[PDB]
Design a protein around this ligand. Structure first.
Ligand code: G93
Ligand code: MG
Length: 263
């Protein structure tokens, strides 16, 4: 992790990190603008099993051009003493995730949660229309900028044409085929959690959470948290239907129903 990548992007403070990658705030010295740079860890940057996933993340994200989807600007490899260092240059979102918001400020107001999630539906529907399934819809992958613009990010496991158990769908868990309606389900879990302050199913173990996704129906949000209408309950519970046929068939359908509740 040198000071500059290709004598172009001067890395700044770290914004976040996971098991395989990290994300820095950086400065594009040619264009004189702030960008975010996602870097593949050198600790295990040799394994082509990762190298392909990282390159494929950059391509899937770059295939999408949408205001609610973090934009990819560039990509390459930085020459380092340890070897080649892959990196993705992308739009910098000066904001916080829904995970941070719920953890520090508790559930959102119904009016706001509907607007944020309705914007996320648009991003996902656009992705689905272009043949890319996110697979990792969760509160940590949706951002709200200082502009209050919603930004979906982290395509790291997106499929063209696993995630956290509390947000997996009955089909995404257990390896079955996943389609747009699987992202809808995950988005329903996100909506459930920004409204009530907790996801629909918690458990001491992953198999405990997975089992509930398949067999147990969710507690209606209005029962978990006050100030929640019965019309919002229906939207959330339809997104959390067990059978894909009963869910919203597209993220756009889910958004249309959220607008009805708002208005
Ligand atoms: C660190 C936050 N963060 C950001 C940005 N933060 O400000 N501007 C950003 N852009 N982008 C990502 C991506 C990505 C991607 C593409 C679109 C190229 O696929 N993946 C992951 C990120 O955090 C990881 C989260 C995950 C959970 C805990 N650590 C923080 C990102
Ligand atoms: Mg993430």
């Amino acid at each position: 992790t040198p000071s500059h990548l290709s004598d172009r992007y001067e890395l700044g403070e770290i914004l976040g990190f996971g098991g395989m990658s990290e994300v820095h705030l950086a400065r594009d010295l040619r264009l004189h603008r702030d960008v975010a740079v996602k870097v593949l860890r050198a600790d295990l940057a040799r394994d082509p099993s990762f190298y392909l996933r990282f390159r494929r993340e950059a391509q899937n994200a770059a295939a999408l051009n949408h205001p609610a989807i973090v934009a990819v600007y560039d990509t390459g490899e930085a020459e380092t003493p340890a070897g080649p260092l892959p990196y993705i240059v992308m739009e910098y979102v000066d904001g916080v995730t829904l995970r941070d918001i719920v953890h520090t400020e508790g559930p959102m107001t119904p009016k706001r949660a509907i607007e944020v999630i309705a914007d996320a539906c648009q991003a996902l529907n656009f992705s689905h229309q272009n043949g890319i399934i996110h697979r990792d819809v969760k509160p940590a992958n949706i951002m709200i900028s200082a502009t209050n613009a919603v930004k979906v990010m982290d395509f790291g496991i997106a499929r063209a044409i696993i995630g956290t158990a509390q947000y997996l769908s009955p089909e995404q868990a257990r390896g079955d085929s996943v389609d747009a309606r699987s992202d809808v389900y995950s988005l329903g879990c996100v909506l459930y959690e920004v409204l009530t302050g907790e996801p629909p199913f918690t458990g001491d173990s992953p198999v405990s959470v997975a089992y509930q996704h398949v067999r147990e129906d969710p507690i209606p949000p209005s029962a978990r948290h006050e100030g929640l209408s019965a019309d919002l309950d229906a939207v959330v519970l339809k997104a959390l239907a067990k059978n894909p046929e009963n869910r919203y068939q597209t993220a756009a359908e889910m958004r249309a129903d959220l607008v009805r509740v708002h208005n």
